[PDB]
Amino acid sequence: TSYDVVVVGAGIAGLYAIHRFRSQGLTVRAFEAASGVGGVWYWNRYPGARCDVESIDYSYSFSPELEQEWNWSEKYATQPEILAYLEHVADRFDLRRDIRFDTRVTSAVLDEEGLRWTVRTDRGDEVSARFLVVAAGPLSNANTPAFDGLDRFTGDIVHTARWPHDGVDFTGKRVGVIGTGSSGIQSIPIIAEQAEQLFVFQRSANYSIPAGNVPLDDATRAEQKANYAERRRLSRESGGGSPHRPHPKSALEVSEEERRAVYEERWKLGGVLFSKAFPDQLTDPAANDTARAFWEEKIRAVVDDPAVAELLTPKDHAIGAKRIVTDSGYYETYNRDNVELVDLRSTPIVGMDETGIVTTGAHYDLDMIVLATGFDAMTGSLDKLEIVGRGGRTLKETWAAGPRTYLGLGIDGFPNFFNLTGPGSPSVLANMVLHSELHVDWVADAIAYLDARGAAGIEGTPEAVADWVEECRNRAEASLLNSANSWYLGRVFMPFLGGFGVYREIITEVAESGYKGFAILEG
Ligand SMILES: Cc1cc2nc3c(=O)[nH]c(=O)nc-3n(C[C@H](O)[C@H](O)[C@H](O)COP(=O)(O)OP(=O)(O)OC[C@H]3O[C@@H](n4cnc5c(N)ncnc54)[C@H](O)[C@@H]3O)c2cc1C
Ligand SMILES: NC(=O)c1ccc[n+]([C@@H]2O[C@H](COP(=O)([O-])OP(=O)(O)OC[C@H]3O[C@@H](n4cnc5c(N)ncnc54)[C@H](OP(=O)(O)O)[C@@H]3O)[C@@H](O)[C@H]2O)c1
């Protein structure tokens, strides 16, 4: 019941963690709440669930064999394909034997003298670890909003977070969807394909850009696969972990014709990359406005009814402030005869009854209600974890006035503890597979550094975290991501905004210099 490393989570990050640590001779125990590997790709399985970043980028690079061997069927893989990929990865590297599934980590307590972590679970596991590595992911489900009389409704209630494995038939059914974030946006067009009638209950419109999905052919695949190494080098040095860069010139320093041409290009590629089309797009409000206009025109042209197009248009929000969603035929869905967009600002939901949804304005008879829930704060999974460090001081207490980290990898009072791809790191702002590889590699090197020195532990110094907190604050203040009610907030803007390449370089040089800003512990 003791191991070198305990890993929390078996999604992209935990799976690579198991592989990397084991390869270096460390014994590893992983714990996963879900019944299988995959993380978000295991449990978030509503129809239309799909990644934001091209699959060739949003995939592992640690294995040349896997890169050559695996064939992505399209530009943006759906979750069943990403799940299949991750299951294949766990097969190839024999990861499952070190994972205990259906097992939720509840507490981790530092033994200050021994420099070890006692990790406890809801299934009665109690294990001892030199290093505790939390790979619990950036996205956890929001609580189902309290609707009165929900318990009274007699039709089916389906949650996008807990989608039935064997699916749900919408044929013949009157369906209501509450929620227009990414879960609602991705499932809506698919729901509308087989539903008798679909009502979308929208409170706040969000920005969405087409995926523009193409099935990747043979001659395309082999040519991208032939140039994979170079694509990875460009990705690892870039702002967002993909082989793309913003325009050389600024948005306002270019002509109106050329501005449309750059925007038109990035619309085709589609996704998150549209947000970073010009260098100052997320920096300067006026440059942002030009992207908002381009977006509004595109949507006005796709949606037949002018008033619906207006209703689908987000009001006084910077485009790309909140993360832009990626869709497959979402706005085209509203041209159908069998879909209605309900403005909840006009007529809010006041409850449900036996037969459907009650708004202030009208009652809606429904056979099925789909709760397209959103995702909790970036720290949501960590907040379900009781982590007791030096002095019996909890992580939740340390983070009360905001997350405090050095590089996202060190916290004073929490030695030999590593939170992956969370606050103080680029996190959701970068390609997370590559980001996971970066963090897992960094942790492994740090462990190797300590083992070579005969040292017991490593810990963020108070001075270094304070410098980093302010460094994060400084990069954040110029950004339109630091919006009044931004999800990246907790006040403290949580992710590192400098860029992924910049951050890689910062943490690599820290390591190379004998871990400045960390204390090496003999313990
Ligand atoms: C529709 C959608 C599309 C996305 N597209 C992209 C994209 O294109 N690019 C991108 O970079 N990111 C994308 N993301 C973000 C995605 O969340 C991350 O890429 C991904 O989750 C990183 O994997 P992870 O292993 O860090 O975390 P996760 O996938 O969340 O895995 C963490 C695992 O830890 C488990 N866990 C948590 N707490 C505990 C505990 N206490 N005990 C035991 N187990 C625990 C969870 O059950 C989960 O299985 C997308 C997310 C969604 C929902
Ligand atoms: N690829 C990625 O990395 C990725 C993917 C998804 C999300 N994210 C991140 O996570 C954050 C949140 O994403 P999200 O899509 O979960 O949040 P979201 O965009 O707010 O989606 C939730 C939806 O449900 C609606 N809703 C919630 N409670 C309601 C109620 N009581 N009545 C009616 N409607 C209600 C919300 O409306 P209101 O807006 O009016 O509350 C919203 O439309 C984003 O900012 C993004 O940074 C990242």
From TrEMBL:
Composition bias type Basic and acidic residues, residue spans: 227-236
Gene3D superfamilies: FAD/NAD(P)-binding domain (3.50.50.60)
Residue segments, region Disordered: 227-256
GO molecular function, one term: NADP binding
Similarity comment: family membership: Belongs to the FAD-binding monooxygenase family.
Binding site for NADP(+) 2: D52, T180, S182, S204, N206
Position of the signal peptide: none
Keywords associated with the record: FAD, Flavoprotein, Monooxygenase, NADP, Nucleotide-binding, Oxidoreductase
Pfam families reported for this sequence: FMO-like
Annotated binding of NADP(+) 1, by residue: D52, T180, S182, R203, S204, F375
Top-level taxon of origin: Bacteria
Originating species: Rhodococcus rhodochrous
Keyword check for NADP: yes
Positions contributing to FAD binding: A13, E32, V40, C51, D52, V53, Y58, V105, M432
Cofactor dependence: FAD
Ranges that cross the membrane: none
Amino acids binding NADP(+) 3: D52, S182, F375, W487
InterPro entries named among the record's database cross-references: FAD-binding_Monooxygenases, FAD/NAD-bd_sf, Flavin_mOase-like
Name of this chain's protein: Steroid monooxygenase
